[PDB]
From a paper:
FlgA is a periplasmic flagellar protein that chaperones P-ring formation. FlgA possesses a typical signal sequence at its N-terminus, recognized by the Sec-dependent pathway, suggesting that FlgA functions as a P-ring assembly chaperone in the periplasm. P-ring formation is a key step enabling the bacterial flagellum to pass through the outer membrane.
By studying the 3D structures of FlgA, we identified a pair of residues, R113 and S190, which are within a suitable distance for cross-linking with a disulfide bond that keeps the structure of FlgA in the closed conformation. The disulfide bond forces FlgA to stay in the closed form and constrains the movement of domain D3. A rivet structure, which lacks the LP-ring of the hook basal-body, was isolated from the wild-type strain expressing FlgAR113C-S190C. These results indicate that the closed form of FlgA can bind to FlgI, but cannot proceed with subsequent steps, thereby inhibiting FlgI from forming the P-ring. The closed form of FlgA is reminiscent of the PapD structure, an immunoglobulin-like periplasmic chaperone for P pilus biogenesis. Upon binding to FlgI, FlgA may adopt the closed structure, since FlgAR113C-S190C showed a strong negative dominant effect on motility of the wild-type strain.
Residue numbers in the entry: 1 to 198
The structure:
């Protein structure tokens, strides 16, 4: 109830915009947790957001890996009308439906900005959750294009220009050759800009 409410609140904050109702519960053994009253929580390399995830509880020098369960509820993209192979996901064939995110199939599309100019790999029936393995996104960024690189670090923000070295869809990884000749990589946002965390 103290660790849970800490986790419930910690995840509720991390899953802002995705879910407005998050309930976390510790699953691992309570005798392995770090001795601090309130520990800093680190995500485990973006392995998962909800369901049964792993969190790094840190106490100055002592590090413990915990297992938790995140019960999130938010919006996801559902097939609203039947869709055919190589069919374009449109406002007519798809819609935003509220449901339990931790009960959704993996790589389910949550944000409508992921599926601008997306096409279906297979036939889809109404109500099915749109998964990124079931679609082909159009390339947001093309190799050879000049792109803006945005690096938000701790205490600072960097804004730079580079050249895209590969074709990449939104939320996919893009490699960029900086003006200085260095090669850096990040993820493509809806804007076509390249975001780098640290």
């Amino acid at each position: 109830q103290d660790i849970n409410a800490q986790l419930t609140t910690w995840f509720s904050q991390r899953l802002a915009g995705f879910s407005d109702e998050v309930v976390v519960t510790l699953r691992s053994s309570p005798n392995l947790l770090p001795s601090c009253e309130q520990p800093a929580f680190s995500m485990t390399g973006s392995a998962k957001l909800w369901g049964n995830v792993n969190v790094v509880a840190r106490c100055a020098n002592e590090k413990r890996y915990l297992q938790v369960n995140v019960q999130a509820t938010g919006n996801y993209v559902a097939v609203a009308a039947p869709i055919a192979r190589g069919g374009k996901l449109t406002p007519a064939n798809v819609t935003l439906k509220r449901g339990r995110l931790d009960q959704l199939p993996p790589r389910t599309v949550l944000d409508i900005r992921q599926i601008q100019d997306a096409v279906s790999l297979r036939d889809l029936a109404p109500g099915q959750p749109v998964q990124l393995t079931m679609i082909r996104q159009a390339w947001r960024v093309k190799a050879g294009q000049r792109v803006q690189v945005i690096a938000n670090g701790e205490g600072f923000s960097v804004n730079a220009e580079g050249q895209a070295m590969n074709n990449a869809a939104v939320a996919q990884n893009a490699r960029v050759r900086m003006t200085s000749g260095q090669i850096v990589s990040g993820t493509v946002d809806s804007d076509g800009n390249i975001l780098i965390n640290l």
